[PDB]
Amino acid sequence: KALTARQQEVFDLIRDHISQTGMPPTRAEIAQRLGFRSPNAAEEHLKALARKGVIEIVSGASRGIRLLGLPLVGRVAAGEPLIEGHYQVDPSLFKPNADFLLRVSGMSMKDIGIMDGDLLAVHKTQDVRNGQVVVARIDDEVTVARLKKQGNKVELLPENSEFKPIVVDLRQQSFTIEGLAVGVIRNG
Amino acid sequence: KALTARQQEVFDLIRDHISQTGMPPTRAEIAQRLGFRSPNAAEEHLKALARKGVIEIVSGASRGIRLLGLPLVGRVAAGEIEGHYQVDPSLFKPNADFLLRVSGMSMKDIGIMDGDLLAVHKTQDVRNGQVVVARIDDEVTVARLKKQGNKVELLPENSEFKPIVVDLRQQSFTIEGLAVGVIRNGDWL
DNA sequence: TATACTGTATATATATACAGTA
DNA sequence: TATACTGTATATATATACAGTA
């Protein structure tokens, strides 16, 4: 259930007042700021927002208004055959901004510091140039490699002396660019 | 003007209560959580925090307490205060305290590269085999520890790089912390 | 019943002063 | 005078019910 034009204005004010004072507004402060002659107008507006499920009202407590990271969506193949959890990491820490994370499975990207078990930061896009590290999907198998497209022939280059490049023909195999690899997180 | 042990605890309480409930505590809530039987004990504690200039008390206003991520300190050598990053400290085991920009390719074989941000937990309690952040005569270095009494050996993870042998009887040694993780954020084509 | 308010009332939550003790 | 509290008191800040209007 979406908020009304005036309910959104109250929600926006609460968000602004917390940002400006460091504490939620009182019903009298909401009324004063929005132009209500009665604090009850603010009260019943808060009850509606609580019913919509955007705020929580702590009963009895003064200024008792509660306003209600990068997701690990699975595994990416780095040589070895193929939603899980949330990690509180800043998205704008990468260039371009990371949208999701994939747990790397394999050692094909060893030489560039991408290891088996690493959390690969990925920016959701289909636009990737050659030479860039891409997260590509071949017949329902998500794979990480360095991109080299030549029309109907697509080479997926590894960063390992032991691993061979995966050659894909689009005329007989399904291919989807999932995104661009923008960074790596290791935790154990 | 430094804070006393109890004054710091009150400051750490407010910060915690704002982080959990979204609002500053009342005098009674501080008193209740810390164990005081009188809300006045919390009051004079806040007044003392106000005098030392760590908080601000909004007069008349209920819950009128106004307070006044991981840091990248510098660089760590891998063969060869600065910035703040909003990364979860409790994402690593043990919890990371600060970050350090890796400079060199001595830890290549385990995926620590030149330009990587190294997550470090600040401790001096380290064992052999662990990847450690150590200081050799004002030079911060990342390597795998191998302590043998006086002869401390700092081993790299690269076939091209030779181990650093440090003698404690003649060289300054300080364990800065334990390497808990790695964050890479380069914009490479 | 719902949104969106005015206007009044009131129990209680809360800050905060004052008087003490160690 | 300061820290670090107990214990009491109270003006007022605040939530929140209740009666209306459009």
UniProtKB/Swiss-Prot annotation, chain B:
GO terms for molecular function: DNA binding; DNA-binding transcription repressor activity; identical protein binding; sequence-specific DNA binding; serine-type endopeptidase activity; transcription cis-regulatory region binding. Belongs to the peptidase S24 family. Disruption phenotype: Cells are filamented, accumulate DNA double-strand breaks, have viability defects at 10 ng/ml ciprofoxacin. Synthetically lethal in combination with a priB deletion. The record marks A78, G79 as: Cleavage. The active site is at S106 (for autocatalytic cleavage activity), A143 (for autocatalytic cleavage activity). It catalyses: Hydrolysis of Ala-|-Gly bond in repressor LexA. Its EC number is 3.4.21.88. The gene is lexA. This is LexA repressor. GO terms for biological process: DNA damage response; DNA repair; DNA replication; DNA-templated transcription; negative regulation of DNA-templated transcription; proteolysis; SOS response. Homodimer. Represses a number of genes involved in the response to DNA damage (SOS response), including recA and lexA. Binds to the 16 bp palindromic sequence 5'-CTGTATATATATACAG-3'. In the presence of single-stranded DNA, RecA interacts with LexA causing an autocatalytic cleavage which disrupts the DNA-binding part of LexA, leading to derepression of the SOS regulon and eventually DNA repair. Implicated in hydroxy radical-mediated cell death induced by hydroxyurea treatment. Disulfide bonds: none annotated.
